[PDB]
Amino acid sequence: GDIKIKIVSGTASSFQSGSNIEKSFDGDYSTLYHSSWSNGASNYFPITLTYNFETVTDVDYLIYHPRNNGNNGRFKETEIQYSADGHTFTKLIDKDFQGSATAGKVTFDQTIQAKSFRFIVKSGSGDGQGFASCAEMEFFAK
Numbered sequence: 114g115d116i117k118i119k120i121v122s123g124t125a126s127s128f129q130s131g132s133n134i135e136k137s138f139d140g141d142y143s144t145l146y147h148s149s150w151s152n153g154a155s156n157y158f159p160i161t162l163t164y165n166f167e168t169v170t171d172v173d174y175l176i177y178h179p180r181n182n183g184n185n186g187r188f189k190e191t192e193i194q195y196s197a198d199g200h201t202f203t204k205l206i207d208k209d210f211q212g213s214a215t216a217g218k219v220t221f222d223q224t225i226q227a228k229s230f231r232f233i234v235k236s237g238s239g240d241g242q243g244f245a246s247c248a249e250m251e252f253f254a255k
């Protein structure tokens with residue numbers, strides 16, 4: 114069957130203390146990555162999230178898992194990027210997660226060779242202008 118790719122590290126351009134990026138790859142669907150609660154700035158969005166593998170890897174699809182209760186931070190419009198070496202990034206696709214309360218699967222047209230994936234989150238649901246949050250982010254090869 115399908116094989117889950119191991120995320121070894123990541124970064125977030127915005128995070129609330131204790132809700133940094135690595136909380137969205139701890140295998141726990143209740144723990145959250147969550148952007149900073151100070152979401153008033155005009156340049157608060159976009160919020161840029163990066164997930165790293167140990168080495169360049171074949172990847173066929175991903176699944177974004179939003180928080181399964183509460184509405185703050187469910188992804189809306191995003192740009193998905195990836196990098197073969199972890200340094201230079203390439204646009205994959207624009208993906209609108211629609212502020213959905215359930216998981217969003219993105220299936221790539223062809224297998225990608227990526228050491229890193231990157232999400233430019235343009236918008237997300239929630240109070241005020243919104244937030245960005247994620248219970249778990251997953252990557253798979255077929």
Ligand SMILES: CC(=O)N[C@H]1[C@@H](O[C@H](C)[C@H](N)C(=O)O)O[C@H](CO)[C@H](O)[C@@H]1O[C@@H]1O[C@H](CO)[C@H](O)[C@H](O)[C@H]1O
Binds near residue numbers: 183240
């Ligand atoms: C559980 C809940 O709905 N909390 C929201 C609520 O918080 C009030 C003030 C209080 N702490 C409580 O009822 O528990 O109302 C505020 C808006 O004032 C906010 O929506 C609370 O949600 C939380 O918002 C923060 C960011 O400000 C995070 O997104 C938390 O995950 C979220 O629960």
Ligand SMILES: [Ca+2]
Binds near residue numbers: 137139145
């Ligand atoms: Ca988690």
